[PDB]
């Protein structure tokens, strides 16, 4: 699957693809924190 040395980071690799959607959520977090200008 992944070379045997990096195999330890098999969970780290599984959590990579959902990092993009979070940016769009963070932008709403940001906006509510400054109280919506």
């Amino acid at each position: 699957k992944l070379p045997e040395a990096y195999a330890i980071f098999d969970p780290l690799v599984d959590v990579l693809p959902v990092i993009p959607v979070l940016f769009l959520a963070l932008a709403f977090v940001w906006q509510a924190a400054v109280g919506f200008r």
Partner: peptide, 28 residues
């Protein structure tokens, strides 16, 4: 041995940046 340690950390990574700028008041 836990590798769930970074999946813990990586979800709070975002708002901690904003939280501190709101502690250090300026440019939110």
């Amino acid at each position: 041995i836990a590798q769930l340690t970074m999946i813990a950390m990586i979800g709070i990574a975002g708002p901690m940046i904003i939280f501190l700028l709101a502690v250090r008041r300026g440019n939110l």
